[PDB]
Design an enzyme around this catalytic site. Structure first.
Site, PDB file in Angstrom:
ATOM      1  N   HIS A  78      56.407  54.565  42.674  1.00 39.30           N
ATOM      2  CA  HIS A  78      57.135  55.543  41.540  1.00 39.30           C
ATOM      3  C   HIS A  78      58.108  54.767  40.592  1.00 39.30           C
ATOM      4  O   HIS A  78      57.879  54.876  39.459  1.00 39.30           O
ATOM      5  CB  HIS A  78      57.967  56.464  42.110  1.00 39.30           C
ATOM      6  CG  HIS A  78      57.262  57.374  43.280  1.00 39.30           C
ATOM      7  ND1 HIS A  78      56.678  58.591  42.682  1.00 39.30           N
ATOM      8  CD2 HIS A  78      57.273  57.411  44.508  1.00 39.30           C
ATOM      9  CE1 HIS A  78      56.127  59.179  44.051  1.00 39.30           C
ATOM     10  NE2 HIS A  78      56.358  58.439  45.061  1.00 39.30           N
ATOM     11  N   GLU A  84      59.230  53.302  47.690  1.00 40.28           N
ATOM     12  CA  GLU A  84      59.462  54.235  46.527  1.00 40.28           C
ATOM     13  C   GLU A  84      59.434  53.454  44.855  1.00 40.28           C
ATOM     14  O   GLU A  84      59.278  54.047  44.129  1.00 40.28           O
ATOM     15  CB  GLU A  84      60.816  54.995  46.615  1.00 40.28           C
ATOM     16  CG  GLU A  84      60.837  55.819  47.999  1.00 40.28           C
ATOM     17  CD  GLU A  84      59.703  57.197  47.660  1.00 40.28           C
ATOM     18  OE1 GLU A  84      60.093  57.454  46.621  1.00 40.28           O
ATOM     19  OE2 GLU A  84      58.926  57.137  48.515  1.00 40.28           O
ATOM     20  N   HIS A 126      65.200  61.292  48.540  1.00 43.02           N
ATOM     21  CA  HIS A 126      63.712  60.997  48.892  1.00 43.02           C
ATOM     22  C   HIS A 126      63.120  60.106  47.780  1.00 43.02           C
ATOM     23  O   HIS A 126      62.718  59.007  48.012  1.00 43.02           O
ATOM     24  CB  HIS A 126      62.840  62.231  49.120  1.00 43.02           C
ATOM     25  CG  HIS A 126      61.552  62.307  49.335  1.00 43.02           C
ATOM     26  ND1 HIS A 126      60.401  63.040  49.203  1.00 43.02           N
ATOM     27  CD2 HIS A 126      60.552  60.728  49.199  1.00 43.02           C
ATOM     28  CE1 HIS A 126      59.447  62.486  49.645  1.00 43.02           C
ATOM     29  NE2 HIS A 126      59.362  61.183  49.466  1.00 43.02           N
TER      30      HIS A 126
HETATM   31  N1  LIG Z   1      59.499  62.142  52.833  1.00 42.66           N
HETATM   32  C1  LIG Z   1      59.847  60.898  53.307  1.00 42.66           C
HETATM   33  N2  LIG Z   1      58.909  59.729  53.440  1.00 42.66           N
HETATM   34  C2  LIG Z   1      59.454  58.909  54.294  1.00 42.66           C
HETATM   35  C3  LIG Z   1      60.807  58.759  54.519  1.00 42.66           C
HETATM   36  N3  LIG Z   1      60.953  57.235  55.147  1.00 42.66           N
HETATM   37  C4  LIG Z   1      59.854  56.784  55.130  1.00 42.66           C
HETATM   38  N4  LIG Z   1      58.862  57.667  54.462  1.00 42.66           N
HETATM   39  C5  LIG Z   1      57.500  57.160  54.340  1.00 42.66           C
HETATM   40  O1  LIG Z   1      57.244  57.379  52.744  1.00 42.66           O
HETATM   41  C6  LIG Z   1      56.036  58.097  52.413  1.00 42.66           C
HETATM   42  C7  LIG Z   1      56.394  58.887  51.321  1.00 42.66           C
HETATM   43  O2  LIG Z   1      55.796  58.514  50.182  1.00 42.66           O
HETATM   44  P1  LIG Z   1      55.862  59.547  48.818  1.00 42.66           P
HETATM   45  O3  LIG Z   1      55.745  60.789  48.545  1.00 42.66           O
HETATM   46  O4  LIG Z   1      57.277  59.443  48.335  1.00 42.66           O
HETATM   47  O5  LIG Z   1      55.208  58.557  47.602  1.00 42.66           O
HETATM   48  C8  LIG Z   1      55.809  59.096  53.620  1.00 42.66           C
HETATM   49  O6  LIG Z   1      54.672  59.253  53.937  1.00 42.66           O
HETATM   50  C9  LIG Z   1      56.420  58.227  54.967  1.00 42.66           C
HETATM   51  O7  LIG Z   1      55.353  57.500  55.418  1.00 42.66           O
HETATM   52  C10 LIG Z   1      61.785  59.726  54.514  1.00 42.66           C
HETATM   53  O8  LIG Z   1      63.069  59.891  54.747  1.00 42.66           O
HETATM   54  N5  LIG Z   1      61.252  60.780  53.969  1.00 42.66           N
END
Ligand SMILES: Nc1nc2c(ncn2[C@@H]2O[C@H](COP(=O)(O)O)[C@@H](O)[C@H]2O)c(=O)[nH]1
Length: 191
Positions: free
Chosen positions: A89, A85, A35
């Site tokens: 981050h 990401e 993630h």
């Molecule tokens: N958790 C998650 N978010 C994803 C994924 N692919 C795209 N996203 C997008 O990335 C955001 C995650 O933000 P993070 O919490 O990492 O800052 C989600 O709200 C969504 O719109 C995935 O595989 N997992």
């Protein structure tokens, strides 16, 4: 600016089980994927730090590994996920890890932290049945040496709790594992 890292892996089927409508490629995967790699500070994730814009050319050599270990499981564009990401981050640890090193770090962490592999032998692999929080954390600590962080999600309709993510905590050096200090799972959950 950061004192540690949260290396967050997601269980594709569980994640997608919450999207009650529409497609979700995660419904077909059978292994934990990345993630993100989140720099931490004072028990909270450091986000949106000023840094270099995402540059795909810096990680071109890792595209096969990233498409395999860090795909998006919700959407279709993997690069968009990596970009997000990095900007939200990755920039927070750019003082010591440039983009190439950051993504390489996540890939190495994934290859060195095989969750299902560590659970399989103790009959703790996924099967849609109830698991014990202490048991799972215990198996992972026994294998890797430190306690992981377990992340669960509750189905709004059945109120059943499912394991969705597993966090491996690392020191600021990005290589030494340390104990995580928070779980969002109850004593039991479906996995
Ligand atoms: N958790 C998650 N978010 C994803 C994924 N692919 C795209 N996203 C997008 O990335 C955001 C995650 O933000 P993070 O919490 O990492 O800052 C989600 O709200 C969504 O719109 C995935 O595989 N997992």
């Amino acid at each position: 600016e950061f004192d540690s890292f949260w290396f967050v892996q997601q269980w594709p089927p569980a994640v997608c089980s919450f999207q009650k409508s529409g497609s979700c490629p995660g419904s077909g995967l059978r292994t934990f994927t990345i993630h993100g790699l989140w720099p931490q500070q004072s028990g909270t994730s450091l986000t949106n730090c000023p840094g270099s814009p995402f540059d795909i050319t810096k990680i071109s050599h890792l595209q096969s590994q990233l498409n395999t270990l860090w795909p998006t499981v919700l959407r279709a564009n993997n690069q968009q996920f990596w970009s997000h990401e990095w900007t939200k981050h990755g920039t927070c640890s750019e003082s010591t890890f440039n983009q190439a090193a950051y993504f390489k770090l996540a890939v190495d962490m994934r290859n060195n932290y095989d969750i299902i592999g560590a659970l399989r032998p103790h009959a703790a692999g996924p099967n849609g049945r109830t698991k014990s929080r202490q048991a799972i954390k215990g198996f992972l600590k026994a294998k890797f040496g430190k306690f992981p962080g377990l992340r669960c999600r509750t189905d709004p309709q059945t109120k059943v709790s499912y394991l969705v993510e597993v966090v491996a905590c690392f020191a600021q050096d990005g290589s030494t594992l340390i104990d995580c200090t928070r779980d969002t799972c109850g004593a039991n959950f479906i996995f």
